[PDB]
RNA sequence: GGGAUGGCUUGUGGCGGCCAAGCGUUCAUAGCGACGUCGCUUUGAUCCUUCGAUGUCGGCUCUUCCUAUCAUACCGAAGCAGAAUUCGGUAAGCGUUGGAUUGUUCACCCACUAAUAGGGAACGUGAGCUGGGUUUAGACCGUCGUGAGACAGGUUAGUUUUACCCUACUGAUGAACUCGUCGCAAUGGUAAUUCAGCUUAGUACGAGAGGAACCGCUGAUUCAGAUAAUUGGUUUUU
RNA sequence: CGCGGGGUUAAGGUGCCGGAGUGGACGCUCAUCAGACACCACAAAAGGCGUUAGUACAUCUUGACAGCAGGACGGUGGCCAUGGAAGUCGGAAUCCGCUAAGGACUGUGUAACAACUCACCUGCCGAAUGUACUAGCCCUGAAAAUGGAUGGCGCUCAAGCGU
């Protein structure tokens, strides 16, 4: 496009105070009708959210399940 | 020239000498071009070509899929409707719409303004939703009309559909039964969201129990009229 | 709104103002550029006004209409004694012109 | 106001409003067959029917041409008779021998001929004059369809010196 | 081709849209009512016009039936407005004439009554060949 | 003098695509819900029917440029039905009159509608749903507007042949020579092969003698089988022998 | 992530001279000298071995490593122009109209131009000024043939390019109408 | 790396052969090596070495591995 | 006595069913779901089905802006042979016209033309001139009313009448620096446009019918700036 | 929140206008009208061969990814169809041998063959790669119509963004 040469109307960033508030206004009661969806939704939610382990790169994370295998081993035998 | 003489042009002569080599880095130059109109096109023309892309990504995904699982009807009908075009086919005596938006007076009808001064009377109303006004309808005197139907807006048919079969037909309506706003617009017939009408369900071919043909039932209208400028319906089975 | 039927605005807005001129004698606002390998001549000179004739003239233009024909075309006379020449002004180039 | 637009649970919304038997429609499709038409008798009330069920279909060549070009498209799709991936190979022809190809020639430039006849026997010109027009403005037929609508009795005014001339079929 | 003739100076056009010439040919026609000049530009108000040499469209007011029908395109041979020639003689002829043609600018008459103009005929082979006086 | 003045016939996305950047870029988009009533009911009037205007002048542009099979001459008639089967031909052209009448009395429904509606919402929606169902019938119409391209090229590319004319009508066997007398007797590009079927449509050359124009017509070969056994390769042969009142030279190759 | 050290290596010829100041080179060999003005890019020059230059980069981004690698074919094709030339073979091709190519060295400025005449029947004359240092020829052994050889790369494909971009078919079906001027072969003089 | 070259999926039917190609071929000269008195090594150094279908069909008796 | 929806909008219908990458769920296998798809909405026809003003638009005269480009410039693609085009891109520099029709939503027809593109600056109330919505008082006709009168309505005739103020704009003088002559040029403005004909050439291209272009040359359209030798007009040269 | 003097702060600020830092540390970002008072809409599970940081899966000296040099075969011109149709106009099948590997074939091509090419394999080379998602910042994700606005200048290892 011919932009550089014959550049167009600029698009203001100077912000109005009617629109400010009405963004203000439009925020808070998306928040409130979200907050009602919310309490009103039928999707099912898991009791225990899936756990993302430990990660590959992390070079002591056969020990760690090492550790993990003897602190089980310990529990099932004191119990 | 005749018949196919580009062709035989390309037999005779070939093509230009660098043809090859141009569409070769054309088509190399692509993938450039592409990011590109990605970053720089603006407006509905950008918006368009997202919109595009985004179903040539679904498309490759698709036949990508396809090509990995490629080393891996539904009612039982007779042997005579095999091979057709078959539908789908998918106490508390409540409607599928139980609850619509209610429509205002002042919403359903507009002050209709006479007389020759700049004080006008203000006694005529229009109704600004479709309406079905019945067999034999003759409009009353100008003079003693205070509701104004207007021809445009008046409605014959509507698409209802069978929820059993899976099947939409054009039927006629027969009568307004019940708009839920107000026993006045059922009385003007008006055809809105959640009206219950009469439908002729002759072409359905329903046959009662003891043997009658069931030629009139009830349906629901579960669009806005006025805004498709259609009737919309599902039978109440 | 938009203007129905569509015209060219009058008048020019190359030529604004529409004032007198400064001065009566009219100024050479550029003079020809300079080449150094020609050799040396000046660039105008004055005369006065007298006013307007007719001639006949022998056209020979290739192509034209009236080509080989006798072509009336009205012409300005400008009256031209010689002038004197009496100074010499030098010229320098600043950043300012 | 705004009103609560609520419909009731019913089980009338579920039943058949209107039935009708088969004694009934074979009755009401002999009536169908028998009725006449009289000049001298007017409608006043018509009788709420299933009139598909009642009414004569319509005849069989007009059923038949009804569907023909869809029965010939699911026959042979437009895909597979011309194009990069055409199928088509033998042609449909309305002559199956050489002498019936010769004479189906004679009788095609004979109606050929007889059509560019027909055709010639039936500067620029001027333009039509908008007078001529009258009589066919959408305000004038607004009105005529809002008379027609108001009214029980429509009287149809002649000439009587050209009565076909201003009848308004 | 639209019937703009070229190699045409510039001369003073007499005849404006909705002026009534003399029929100069024997096509049957006796007058020619002028509504558009071919080659006429875009001015706002501007009546087009047309001079000796210029290929108009007119209708029949008077003359045969047949011809009262047709928009006809028709060159004019004379005006009566003075104009000047190159040669600077301003001229002018006692009528406004016109002869009917096709497009591609041959004689719908065979024959021209009174002179023609010198544009008229060194633009329009045709009518050179049916002028009986060239002036 | 030909079929070759057709317009190019769109698929059915290009000509909605067509259609409606028309409408986007050839009028006004901006309108606003605090105006008068009349204005925006204009506004979304002015949209539906310039929508149906566009798609009306297309589609009688397609209507009539294409040939009318019962107005041509019995030869061009039978070779259009031979290259091109006129059941799908007249079928195609139909469609496309039925789907421009529809479209016309979409626009004229909406039109009405718009007369009566209240709000810039109400209008929107109706002016949407007469451009969407205008777009449906179009979107229906994919196969027959693909058909009629490939036709219109082929029309395009079809040779003259005037069938009121001095004409010699070569024809026989295939690998008799046809092709090569019309070469030698002419100036037209047939191609010459050893192999059979080398022409496989009508090809027509000219030629001048006794200063009269004469034109030749090269065909495919013919076969020794009854007529329902041809192809339409030879039926192209068949039929230009049936119609055309021209001097038969029969190729044999002893 | 910037990469602490990244470096890239040039072979020098025996019979090739190369001279770097404040990132200029010049390269010179037995046909000729060339020099390139290289301060654009930000890079330390320094001599690894002997007939062999080493170009670093310190601290820098990926695109930073990245540009080594441009400045070292650069480098390379420098010293490949002084070495071996570089030749590229063009053909001119018609169908009616013979097209024209005239020859003539310009004395007042020392370059080539280059006349093609005859373009699809076209009265006008092209006229092509090639660059400093690029020499053209029309072939003996060949039929219609132009051959272009220089030291510089750039100025001898550049200019082969301004001869196939000036005559170019306009308003015409290019599957038609085959005439032009295409570049044939690229290679070295030697 | 947001700029890559984007990498053809070969919609074709043969897949690459991997680390079961190999196991085969160990099994396959391993298996052959008991059933036979002598192993010959050959070379064929920048050759076309399509000619060695007929060698392995002159010489049926025997077994050729060219891996 | 008070009073006079708006970071809106634009290009792709609604209803019902199905599929569905995915989201969720994996003590329940439900519920959302893009991309799609399926059903309701004449063999090139018929021309004997035009479906309701409460909401009002106009025209001159003149300037400027937007681009959402009709034409002109350049470019990409297409059986694009040539010619004529079609779709698309950059582009608002430059143009975008007479005319007919008021039994009427004045919108459509005809022509010329390179083309007869669309909008804003009013219509998100609103003193330039002047016609329709339109409407004080006179008057008939129709409808309603016992009537005064009102209106489903139709017709006719009918009073607003600045500028010398300030600013803006267009031009014209000017104090201070002695008067004057010759100059510079910051900054502001800025201008040209389109068609045709000759040659190329009946050439390239083509079966034929037909049929270009670059260089070169000559006119014309629209715009602009001047001028009065000539020709017309004007006459208190009384 | 009475009239004054001194001291200290809050919200907000410290490149200049403007009193106070071109203050310090580590990074990220280059926008053809960036961003700097954003959360709302446009707007989608949206489009980016922009740039980083990660996550999962996978290949790799038994040689991965990219290339170059070569192979890419035999039953077989598989069946039906077609004027012709040999992997490559179509319909349906889609197996075996030789194998290192090679589809009853991915495209170009022929009237049909031929020829070329891809999938796949070997030789040369030589050390890390590939795919898909996630999170940052950047571009696009629709705009009218007098000339204008992060308040203005301007600012690019900031005078932008996070701590
Ligand atoms: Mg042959």
Redesign the interface.
Known sequence: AGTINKPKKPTSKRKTTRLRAKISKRAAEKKRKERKLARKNPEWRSKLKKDPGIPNLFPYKERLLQQIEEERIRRKEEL | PQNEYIERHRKLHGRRLDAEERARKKAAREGHKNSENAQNLRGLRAKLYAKQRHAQKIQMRKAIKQHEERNVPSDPIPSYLLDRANPTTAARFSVPIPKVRGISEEEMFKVVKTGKKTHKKGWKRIVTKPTFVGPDFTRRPVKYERFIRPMGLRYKKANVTHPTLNVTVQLPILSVKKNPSNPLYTQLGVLTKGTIIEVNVSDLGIVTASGKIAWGRYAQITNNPENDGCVNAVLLV | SHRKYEAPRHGSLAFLPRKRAARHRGRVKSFPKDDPKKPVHLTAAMGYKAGMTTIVRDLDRPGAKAHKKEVVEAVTIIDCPPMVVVGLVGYIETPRG | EVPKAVIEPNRKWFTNTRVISQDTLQSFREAMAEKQKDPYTVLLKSNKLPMSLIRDGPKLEDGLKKHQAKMTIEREPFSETFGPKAQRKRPKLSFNTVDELAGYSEQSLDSYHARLEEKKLLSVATAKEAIFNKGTSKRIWNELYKVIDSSDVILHVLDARDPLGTRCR | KRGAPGGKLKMTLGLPVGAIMNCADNSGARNLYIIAVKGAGARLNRLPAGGVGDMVMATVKKGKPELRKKVHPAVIVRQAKPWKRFDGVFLYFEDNAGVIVNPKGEMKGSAITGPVGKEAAELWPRIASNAGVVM | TGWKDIPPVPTAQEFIDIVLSRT?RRLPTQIRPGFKISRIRAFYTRKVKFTQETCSEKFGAIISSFPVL??Q??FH??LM????????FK??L?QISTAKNLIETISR??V??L????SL??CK??KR??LGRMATLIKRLK??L??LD??RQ?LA???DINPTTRTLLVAGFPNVGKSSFVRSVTR??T?VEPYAFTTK?L??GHLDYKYLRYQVIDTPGILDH???????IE?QS?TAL??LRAAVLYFMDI | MRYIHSEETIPVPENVKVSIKSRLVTVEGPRGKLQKDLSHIAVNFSVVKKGVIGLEIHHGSRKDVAALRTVRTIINNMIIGVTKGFKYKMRYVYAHFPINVNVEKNAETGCYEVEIRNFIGEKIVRKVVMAPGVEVEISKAQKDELILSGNSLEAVSQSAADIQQICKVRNKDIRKFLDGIYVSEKGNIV | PKSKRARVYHLTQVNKKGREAKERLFSNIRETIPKYQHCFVFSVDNMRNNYLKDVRHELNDCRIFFG
């Open positions: 986007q019962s107005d001459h019995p008639r039978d039905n031979i290259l091109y089967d006129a059941d799908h079928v195609a139909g429904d909406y009405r509608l007369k009566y509606a209240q919402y109400q929606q109706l749903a007469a196969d027959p693909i058909y490939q036709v082929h590319r079809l040779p037209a590009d191609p449509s090809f027509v009854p007529l329902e056994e041809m192809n339409t039926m068949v049936a119609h």
